[PDB]
Paper text:
Orotidine 5′-monophosphate decarboxylase (OMPDC) converts orotidine 5′-monophosphate (OMP) into uridine 5′-monophosphate (UMP) and CO2 during the final step of de novo pyrimidine synthesis, which is essential for producing DNA and RNA nucleotides. Recognized as one of the most efficient enzymes, OMPDC accelerates the decarboxylation rate by a factor of 1017, and exhibits a net transition-state stabilization (ΔG #) of 31 kcal/mol. Its unique ability lies in achieving this substantial enhancement without the aid of bioorganic cofactors or metal ions, relying solely on interactions between the substrate OMP and residues at the active site. However, the key catalytic amino acids at the active site are highly conserved, including two lysines (K281, K314) and two aspartic acids (D312, D317), which form the so-called catalytic tetrad in the sequence Asp317-Lys314-Asp312-Lys281 (numbering from the human enzyme).
Unexpectedly, high-resolution crystal structures showed xanthosine-5′-monophosphate (XMP) in the human OMPDC wild-type and thymidine-5′-monophosphate (dTMP) at the active site of the variant OMPDC Thr321Asn. We identified a second endogenous ligand for the OMPDC Thr321Asn variant, which is dTMP. Notably, dTMP lacks a 2′–OH group, unlike the substrate OMP and the product UMP, as it is a deoxy nucleotide. Compared to the wild-type enzyme, ligand binding in the variant displaces the catalytic tetrad from its usual conformation. Using ITC, we estimated the dissociation constant (K D) for dTMP binding to Thr321Asn as 431 ± 44 nM. The endogenous ligand dTMP binds with high, nanomolar affinity to the Thr321Asn variant but also with 10∧3 lower affinity to the wild-type enzyme.
Residue numbers in the entry:
A (entry chain A), B (entry chain A): 223 to 479
The structure:
């Protein structure tokens, strides 16, 4: 029933992006995604280089990157290839299909040209996925659907979460998993990534709520933890990243028996 | 019960941004918002100048504007002041509060520095509004909550729509209305803006669905129509904008008796 990341990478129905990710997770013993919520390219690239060995994925946030250029992205790709992690852009695609197609491909950011993974809200209906899919690109790309949110008052519950799971099933040629607080699909080909993670209980003053790596990976059945401030605002960032990596990895191992 | 836009502009509980908008709608006899879904600054500014007299609002889409700069925004502000329309940015704010605060103020776009209006999805809970509010700015700014969507399979229905209305009520110092398909609040201080509008029946091939100005303003009780392709893809854009303006304006008048 429960399979290692390396075995999941070989599943018949696995998407190539998911397989690549699962293989590097197994190789590096990491199921940590760094949320690089920073405003300067210098710091983004410093984090990518210093923490690259500890992470399976780096979540970029280009809408707050004051000095974004595509040359910054090219240097991030070099680090991602060297250290072996995927690039996941934070942008909350959440529009009619015709608009998300334009937003994914175009503008200054040209997200599709560099992001291995993107995430979408399911509120618009399945056109949100179909519009992203319609971007022509001869590269391997995946999408994550936001099935649950970590924040107080989230409406991504109940039938909304179920709709996200059905939408993912039905678009598995492109959708490779979920942003969720827990396992929401029983199909092992899908990835579950969980934000709202810190070692200590608490939250922020703007509705964020935290749970621990052991809780979300071990008890709630998710695959990957997404951690921003727990690392990037820590006194010792590498020490923090390693604590999060070890916590999430052991919690995952505990489900393999 | 039903009040003109000019009378609504004087309501005791009206927000200053809503009042400014309602006054110019009455003065210019327009309840049309142009959706300027274009990739070049030249075209954005050509549309703003040519169609400015016909519109109450221009919805920018900076995430697809290949040559965005803040100098383009400054020139748009000049046109908005000259022709008398508000600037509404399309970005679908849809994140935890701590992130939307950063996204509204920062990055290359500095949206809060120029957008009179923004819109947010309610799925994260009320932190999505509280985070936008927390941006310090000594200017008049408002937010619209996405209570319904026009696209096939939209999940913004039922209890989700009701949650959006409650969130708006409860944050009326900043939330000035809704993106919706119909009137969703009975409070006349709130603005209802409806996308998914074309003169003819139909849709697109990515889940957009259209209703007419008469249907959405006259029968469904909305205030403003948001029109993109019906104008910007028309053979004669000014002719189209005037047809949409006249349609929406008459439909509104029909409810005043
Ligand atoms: O439900 C969600 C979806 C996404 N994120 C993202 O994960 C990161 C959490 O950062 P932090 O609270 O660990 O600093 C942020 O970038 C935020 O967008 C959440 O926190 N919750
Ligand atoms: O429920 C919604 C919310 C927003 N819009 C926006 O309104 C415009 C509709 O354009 P068009 O279909 O009139 O070209 C697009 O920019 C889209 O983001 C919708 O169509 N539906
Ligand atoms: O579906 C695909 O594979 C391509 C890649 C980006 C979106 N379209
Ligand atoms: O609430 C307000 O009025 C200011 C303006 C932008 C967000 N904060």
């Amino acid at each position: 029933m429960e399979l290692s990341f390396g075995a999941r990478a070989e599943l018949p129905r696995i998407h190539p992006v998911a397989s690549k990710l699962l293989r590097l997770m197994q190789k590096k013993e990491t199921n940590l995604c760094l949320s690089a919520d920073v405003s300067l390219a210098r710091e983004l690239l410093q984090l990518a280089d210093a923490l690259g060995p500890s992470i399976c994925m780096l979540k970029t946030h280009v809408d707050i990157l004051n000095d974004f250029t595509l040359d910054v992205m090219k240097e991030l790709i070099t680090l991602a290839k060297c250290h072996e992690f995927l690039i996941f852009e934070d942008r909350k695609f959440a529009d009619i299909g015709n608009n998300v197609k334009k937003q994914y491909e175009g503008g200054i950011f040209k997200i599709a040209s560099w992001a291995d993974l993107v995430n979408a809200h399911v509120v618009p209906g399945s056109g949100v996925v179909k519009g992203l899919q319609e971007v022509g690109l001869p590269l391997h790309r995946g999408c994550l659907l936001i099935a649950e949110m970590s924040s107080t008052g989230s409406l991504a519950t109940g039938d909304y979460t179920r709709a996200a799971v059905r939408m993912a099933e039905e678009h598995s040629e492109f959708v490779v998993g979920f942003i969720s607080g827990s396992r929401v699909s029983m199909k092992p080909e899908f990835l579950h990534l969980t934000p709202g993670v810190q070692l200590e209980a608490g939250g922020d003053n703007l509705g964020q709520q935290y749970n621990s790596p052991q809780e979300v990976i071990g008890k709630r059945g998710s695959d990957i933890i997404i951690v921003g401030r727990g690392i990037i605002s820590a006194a010792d960032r590498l020490e923090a990243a390693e604590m999060y990596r070890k916590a999430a990895w052991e919690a995952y191992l505990s489900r393999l028996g």
